[PDB]
Ligand binder design. Structure first.
Ligand SMILES: O=P(O)(O)O[C@H]1[C@H](OP(=O)(O)O)[C@@H](OP(=O)(O)O)[C@H](OP(=O)(O)O)[C@@H](OP(=O)(O)O)[C@H]1OP(=O)(O)O
Lengths: 231, 231, 231, 231, 231
């Protein structure tokens, strides 16, 4: 038995966190899981932080693969044998309903049953599906909607920034730069009307009125003022 | 067995209520629960008042750690009569399906199984996740939305006040200082138009028409008249 | 032997990377290494990515502590074969010249020798020294010197960016918003006159002459012309 | 023993030279070394031409992995002569202190010790580190410093060209189109005034005085004359 | 054996940290180490924090004294097993190659060998040399060089402040009242023009160009304009 080492698992986690789910994660995984048991592969998968939608898609793909294996490979009545090794099922290959001893026995039996390799193939199918379909979210993509309240936008921005992979200084710089930048024009003009030294609460109070009756009437009157004056 | 004392439990409760879930709770916990059985740790956790979201995240982390323990650690189906002590499961370490005597036996038998230490590590992981992800709400954060009715804002304000950790006089001071200050400009203009001695019912009646047809027509007409008289 | 779990080790790594070496790492380490062997502690220390200066200072502190332990504690001349084990030394406590079985034997023998606890104390002393003395480097701190060539500053910036913990999109935004901003005034004037659409190669070509005879003559002539025109 | 074929090894060398150390080298390496002994992997690594810094980082990563393997895996005191082989160490897995026969015995014995697979994992970790941190040098990146003498820049350019992978005609075209282009403005002015037919010796003679007292005085006088004539 | 008490050792540490290495440390040391073994003397010396240069000079003096003792005192060839002990050497007196039991036996045997007294004399000679030749560094002595970049001076200032023995509030006050004051005139002019409310990053940005072509040209132009206007 050669269980996955802390350095290898950490390298896998850093690869996933640095490349998000770019295609380059597919080779790295295959390179960091050679000879791995299904338990080691499950440890690799469960240690990933974030990307909950991607892991959900991966779990769905693994479940479909296990169901297909169960369909194609029938169960046996289970007669006793001198070796008495039960035939693995989809859950056994996925490691959900099997122990490390059972996986090792299957992998080192004669003839061998490479449950680890089948599970790797399932995980690679899921990873390819993730690469095709999943697009990671970023603090750079958090923009205020045309009618979204400024408080809701600030809450979304801070929720995304809390899960962002960056240092605290970088996160403070992101707050100083992108929050006002990615606001909608109605709130952005008010924010620019305020000084650059305004604290968060002052911006919240300033934009608390955007989309209300008073602000709507004020902007409508300001727009009509130009057309009246030009006439 | 030195169970947790009422003084230590009370001190933990005050630490949680005073520092919300700032990083400072992690040392205090580690200092107030050394040598504690999983039952004592559960008693410490369940005594926390409020912070239901943080408690939910902590429970999710604890369940994840227990599931990972169950996955990695196999369960033997053969009972042994000499030294009859079952191997703890994840829920047994978490104290959900284990008794105090069983936890003491695990913490005392040779070789020791530090169920309390493992549970404490799981709780610390959950607390670190809470510190990273959880932001407690305060009465200072209850602001009226631009399109939110004043009655709904008042209901939210009083619901948050009822859960605020403060004395009654402080709560009345917050009611008299923050309810009008943290309202949207459309309602705040009407509230300032009313006298400072206006009651809650008068304040609600005055703002009952904000966002309605009459109030919107009135503000639009006021803005139009201002810009027309400017010309 | 309750060896450190993959999730605990990964959580330690993320704590170190997220908090750099702020004091908050000290409570986490103590909470994540309770009951750990010197081998486990060395595994936690060796898995830290980056912060080479901090790890060097930690290793120096550990070496001083081991040397002091060796100075205070003398060796024994005659080994006791029956029912006795070798007395640990500084390197044995630090795990450099010790095996996991020997460490477990020391912690399990009566009377116990808490080699893990002594090593934890040494590591905490080193971590406190790091917190006092070490300041991490950031991409935000990379600024062009008054006389530094623009190529050298760009090389330093890109090295720090490659070492930075961030997503690729965030790194691209960092390059787009930090490289020109943190340049010196002599290069910043040319970069701003070049336009926002300029590429990196165009920017380096435009600043290739800053500090050369022609650039110095040109800026001196501009200043002289201004002061003569004022006269 | 399926030793690496000359065509496979040459294809690996061409992959490394063509792609530098882009991520694409990782899938190819794993594809070209599957089933390889540590000796074959060492032959693959040692045949790489150039990229001395990248090979140094790879060797450092391999050394760290071997040291960690030695730390985790203790040695055995008493050798077993009948029907047993020496347990591999970090250097044995890396192939530094191991022979091909011992490697084949390890990957063939029951239970197998996949020394080739472990060494492949270490090399893949090093390659990932290279991909993250290493940027290859190119003749296109050789530029004259603002105060660098033209002779030194020409020497650097010709050294890089000698190290460049290109045909002799292509290298001549690079000399004819890149040396003058990537010179600093002070030298570029003189080179352009010299004419396209100027030889290398003529260009180096013409720029021999850039940065000297006479050249600086002349350029300062030209700028001063321009600004005085404007007045 | 009257080993040095924790209060005595801590008092010695406070004496060194308060008086730096003024002559006053010599009477205190002799008063705080009377009757001490070489081990206690080494514990007193090694616990001193900071003053690395002074400790280096002290160790050099101790090594010189040990070498002179070894030169003057020859070794003995034939050991005397019954009723005799090894004759101390220079390193034995210094405690480097001696154990506490041997030191006590030397200071107790008849005739006594005052290894503690000899080592005290050596340490006193080293301390006298330190008082004569060593001057401690202070945050008050950190000044910007006439040509030193402002960033380098800020880095030196913050390193010295981190190494300074003061409270955090005192360190903040030192930063607020010493950084600008001890800057060179070229940077001080810009810092004063920036205003007292300027932040550290703003101050570094404002002084990023001092010593560059533009700043030199501008100051030369200002001086030239002044003298021309006088004419
Ligand atoms: O606030 P209400 O009195 O109930 O009227 C609203 C309002 O239209 P007006 O302010 O022009 O009267 C909305 O404007 P927004 O707040 O969304 O900007 C509009 O929504 P849209 O202009 O975006 O479509 C919506 O619907 P609609 O104009 O289609 O009628 C309309 O609702 P009602 O007049 O039906 O109540």
């Amino acid at each position: 038995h050669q269980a996955i080492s802390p350095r290898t698992l950490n390298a896998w986690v850093k690869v996933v966190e640095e490349k998000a789910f770019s295609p380059e994660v597919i080779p790295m995984f295959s390179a960091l899981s050679e000879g791995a048991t299904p338990q080691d592969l499950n440890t690799m998968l469960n240690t990933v932080g974030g990307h909950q939608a991607a892991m959900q898609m991966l779990k769905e793909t693994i479940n479909e693969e296990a169901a297909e294996w169960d369909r194609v490979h029938p169960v046996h009545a289970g007669p006793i044998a001198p070796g008495q090794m039960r035939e693995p099922r989809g859950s056994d290959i996925a490691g959900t309903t099997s122990t490390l001893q059972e996986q090792i026995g299957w992998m080192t039996n004669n003839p061998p049953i490479p449950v680890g390799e089948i599970y790797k193939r399932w995980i690679i199918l899921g990873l390819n599906k993730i690469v095709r379909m999943y697009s990671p979210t970023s603090i750079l993509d958090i923009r205020q909607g045309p009618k979204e309240p400024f408080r809701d936008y600030v809450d979304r921005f801070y929720k995304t920034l809390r899960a962002e992979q960056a240092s605290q200084e970088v996160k403070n710089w992101m707050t100083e730069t992108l929050l006002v930048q990615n606001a909608n024009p109605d709130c952005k003009t008010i924010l620019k009307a305020l000084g650059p030294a305004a604290t968060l609460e002052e911006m919240m109070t300033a934009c608390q009125g955007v989309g209300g009756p008073g602000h709507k009437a004020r902007v409508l009157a300001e727009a009509m003022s130009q057309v009246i004056n030009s006439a």
